[PDB]
Design a binder for this molecule. Structure first.
Ligand SMILES: COc1ccncc1CC(=O)N1CCC[C@H](C(N)=O)C1
Ligand SMILES: [Zn+2]
Length: 139
C-alpha cells in the first residue's frame, strides 16, 4: 500500500484504488497502473521534474529505505496477475532491489522530490511507475 498526496490529488496504483478513488476519479491509465483521485485536504508532496536515475525507495516488506540506480521510463513486459492479463506496462523503471506484492505504493524519491511508486517486482528486481511527466499534478 501507499499513495502520493500533491495539492488536491491523491496518486495510487490503479490495481489498489478504492471505491472512493473511483467515485472521485480525475484520471486513470491501465497501461501505467496509475489512478489519480481528488481530495478535500491539500497535499504537500513535491513531485520531481528531472531525469535522475538514482534515488531511494521505501520497502514495506523490510520496513527499510533502499538506495537504487533505476532505468529510464519505458515499456516493460509484466506477467499476468489477478488485476491484469500479461502486457507491456508503460512509463515503468526497474532497479535491482527487494520487493513483494504488498510493497506496491512505496515511494521512490531523488534529491528533487517524488519520482514514482512501486508497481511491479520479482526475482530481485523492483519496478516503479514514473510520475515526473504528469506536469498537471502541480496546477
Ligand atoms: C511489487 O510487486 C511484486 C513484487 C514481487 N513479486 C511480485 C509482485 C507483484 C507484481 O509485480 N504485480 C502484481 C500486482 C500488479 C502489478 C502490475 N503493475 O501489473 C504486478
Ligand atoms: Zn531528481
Amino acid at each position: 500500500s501507499g499513495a502520493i498526496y500533491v495539492g488536491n490529488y491523491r496518486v495510487v496504483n490503479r490495481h489498489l484504488a478504492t471505491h472512493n478513488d473511483w467515485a472521485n476519479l480525475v484520471w486513470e491509465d491501465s497501461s501505467r497502473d496509475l489512478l489519480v483521485s481528488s481530495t478535500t485536504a491539500q497535499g504537500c508532496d513535491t513531485i520531481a521534474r528531472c531525469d535522475c536515475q538514482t534515488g531511494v525507495y521505501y520497502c514495506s516488506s523490510r520496513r527499510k529505505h533502499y538506495p537504487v540506480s533505476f532505468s529510464k521510463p519505458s515499456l516493460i513486459f509484466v506477467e499476468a496477475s489477478e488485476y491484469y492479463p500479461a502486457r507491456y506496462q508503460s512509463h515503468l523503471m526497474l532497479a535491482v532491489g527487494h520487493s513483494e506484492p504488498g510493497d506496491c505504493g512505496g515511494i521512490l524519491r531523488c534529491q528533487h522530490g517524488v519520482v514514482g511508486i512501486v508497481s511491479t517486482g520479482g526475482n530481485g528486481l523492483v519496478g516503479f511507475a514514473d510520475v515526473r511527466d504528469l506536469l498537471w499534478l502541480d496546477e
